[PDB]
């Protein structure tokens, strides 16, 4: 008479979804309710362009079905760079990529009232280690919400 | 063999120890077996190099993160910042900064994997739910990060190599509205470099 | 990709000058080759099977002394001494014994590395000269009879590695192996056969050990405790025309096990 | 240099090798023809076989892997030195070597493992000497030998995948020789130590599996053991075994 | 405690020459020739080659992380002469030339010691010819060829003081394949093998380097030995084969030129 869980969601698919993003060197990670997924953009975009290969829209197909399993009411959708050029080349770079992940991610419906995005280039690293382009350890896309309820 | 509540912050020695009673049944193993000394003898090597490469990677990481999982505590790791988030309703006692001491395996634990980074730098962080009043909120959290401090320092860290502050419900990780959310709320974060 | 980025980007350690002095006991056997391992015969219907030297262990001891100073730079002066003698009774009516003594001085500079926290490593390279000898004498069931005898010294580098993985908790498993070569002069003196000769000549050599290792912290330095096995092998050693061959290697190999004391300055 | 950061991931590789033994100047020489008042000596003329590797690994640490690898080769070759009388030789060597290995980075071209194990091989000697119809006699000679073995590996990577590998080792092993040779009339069974040298170059080029990496590779293998066997059924004493080749070889490693 | 950061960008070439003044050594089997009796007595004399000169050239072109191709050439020729009695003597012609293509790369652990570590491909020719005379006779000798090639692998420590003054040792291992010949006139035979060969050599020694405007020169003097096993083979001699080696000094100049 009355929905059992929430439409089209089933715990054993969330730990089966995060096991395998864990696995395939993306990572998915947990705090309270707070979801982060984070990206190395090797695997996303081309060397350093707001360019999807479409090997990798796999991926983010993926990723936006892990993204419907939980009821959220935002989204934010962040990117990191190594040091290329100027401050104002890779921050318009990561907003561009930003950007494009958020409108791919919101046309594969993903229920989520709002999508945020921001580029903040190479402003918040992860590792003391910048040698390397794109396959960089900090040169990432992160993908952090707050389950609802 | 070994003192049950912190081993008196003494280098704790379960190696050795595994190390002398596999030598031990596999001196027996080649007593029962050959009954020559030799063959004892032989048996003696094989059974301590056989403890040696089950307790050696027994010892290893992998295996103490599984571990400090299995009680209560959560080990995540991302770039070089690494957090071990730990409750404070299993590991500290009802509102008061007195350590949990029927919950010393874990925190015992806890000692052996900051020991792998002998050159890192600790930030330790107390969190509370929202009941209460805000100076409530801010010495408890405050006394509870202190006392993860103090007892992280007793085992044999550095002095300089610590920072302790205690927030109040300012950093949440749930929705402090409901219950098992405000529940994860309630945690101590050891950060390391 | 490795998200996760703390590599090894150090190896070589903190200045440090110190003294070290070890002392080791050596459980071994040595061998020959097939020209020199067997002697005599048994005949069963004209069937003759050969009997081997098979020598009976003995023990064998090392001590060396070490002087680290700066980086991981150290200086290791080394002396191996084996003494054998080993009968081999063929038959009761007549017998051989054996009397093989080895010594070896090894000096060594040593460069220091840890790889990462857990696996550590030390290149080696330095010189080497080794005494060998071999006398062999043959008797009667009570009648001293007359054997040979085969000489040598050498003196030549040798280079290897020193490969240790610890695992924290003071332990280890260590392997180690070098490569030495020396240059030298040998002699041989048969009186069976009546015949001397005396010539220089090429020596190679290859050892290697491979263990467990524990070392205890003490306020003024270090103890190791070092158990395992040892191999070692010593190319056309010596040469005698009596035996049913020619030339003859020298290998050996036994277990062993060694304290090392550190101390700092 | 750089170690490479912690990595978990088990690994499995198949080798097939296409190889050629040597025996040394003691045993290489059998039977003799006299023509023109000279004898010439006929080469021992060994034919290419194929044998095989399995290795199985474990990368668990940071910049380690736990590896054994087994080969085992297999030889059934016929010599004539005369019309009428000839010898087959069968000689089989199989060795298990199981390391532990360290990996090293030192640029984004250069790459190195070094490794220290144990290793243990039987190599085996039947030789069959036949008349032209009547089985004749022959002789055999048995090795088992186990002991260290100590190596480096260095590769060199132009990015892509596409590299080369030198890889060289040395070895000690200890353990029994025996031999028996009928028409001598000789037997015996002693306690023997042999040396061993190995060394291999080749290419490589990997392919990134969603999975994973497969790496597949080609290269050449020598390899001897000093005084491996000995019987004095040949005119010499002492033989060093040996053998060179090349060999094809699929890898696969997959994360954990 | 930090340090071993490999060498950067550096593209330039070398050339070494060097003399060396080598020393030949055979194993028993082939070290022992002619005899002296005296009561019994049997005293074999020691083939003792004579001692020779030899050179070897090295060019080397060095590339991206401090990495070098280099190839070295070493050119031995020894003819010795033994009289084992007053009749006769014996005339013994060594000849061997080694080619050896690396590819190494350079370490710096530390301001004050270096390594090399290097491999690639070693190919040797190695010949002995021994002819037997009557004082006046050219007798039935024989010969002894053997040429291979293989992969060869090694180690190279430099401690350096600074101001170029330094100490070196690099120790080398090889494995070869190819075929050995060998022809006895006086036993009346011939053969050949496929045949392959290990060998090892080390060196030691010291250098001294001064800085140049276009690059910088080493001068090099050491002593070095090397061996392979079972290089030749013939009943002629006592024994039937022989374990090959030299040892000797020599002294070499190294420039390297930047680009």
Known sequence: KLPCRVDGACDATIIKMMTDLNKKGIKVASVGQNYLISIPASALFADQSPRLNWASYSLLNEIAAFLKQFRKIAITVTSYSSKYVSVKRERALTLARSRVVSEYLWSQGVDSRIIFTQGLGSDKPITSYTLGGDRSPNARVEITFRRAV | CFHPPYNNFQPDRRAVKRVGVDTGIGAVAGAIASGTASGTLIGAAAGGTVGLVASIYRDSKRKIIRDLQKQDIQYVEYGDTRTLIIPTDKYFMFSSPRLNEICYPGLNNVIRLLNFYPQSTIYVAGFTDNVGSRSHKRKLSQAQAETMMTFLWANGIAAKRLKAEGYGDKNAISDNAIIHGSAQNRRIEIQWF | ?265
């Open chain 3, 1 to 265: 990709m490795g998200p996760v980025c703390t590599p090894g980007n150090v190896t070589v350690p903190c200045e440090r000058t110190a003294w070290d002095i070890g002392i080791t006991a050596l459980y071994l056997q040595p061998i020959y080759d097939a020209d020199w391992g067997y002697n005599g015969f048994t005949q069963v219907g004209g069937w003759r099977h050969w009997h081997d030297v098979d020598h009976e262990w003995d023990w064998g001891f090392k001590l060396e002394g070490s002087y680290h100073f700066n980086t991981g730079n150290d200086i290791n002066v080394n002396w191996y001494h084996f003494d054998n003698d080993s009968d081999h009774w063929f038959d009761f009516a007549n017998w051989h014994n054996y009397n093989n003594k080895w010594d070896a001085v090894n000096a060594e500079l040593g460069q220091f590395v840890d790889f990462s926290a857990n696996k550590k490593m030390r290149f080696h390279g330095g010189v080497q000269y080794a005494r060998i000898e071999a006398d062999v004498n043959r008797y009667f069931n009570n009648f001293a009879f007359n054997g040979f005898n085969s000489k040598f010294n050498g003196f030549g580098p040798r280079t290897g590695l020193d490969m240790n993985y610890v695992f924290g908790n003071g332990f280890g498993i260590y392997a180690k192996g070098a490569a030495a070569i020396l240059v030298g002069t040998s002699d041989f003196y048969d009186g069976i056969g009546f015949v001397t000769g005396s010539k220089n000549a090429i020596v190679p050599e290859l050892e290697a050990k491979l263990g467990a290792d524990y070392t205890y912290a003490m306020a003024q330095g270090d103890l190791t405790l070092d158990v395992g096995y040892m191999w070692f092998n010593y190319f056309n050693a010596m040469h005698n025309t009596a035996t049913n061959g020619l030339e003859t290697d020298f290998a050996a190999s036994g277990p062993y096990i060694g304290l090392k004391y550190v101390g700092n300055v």
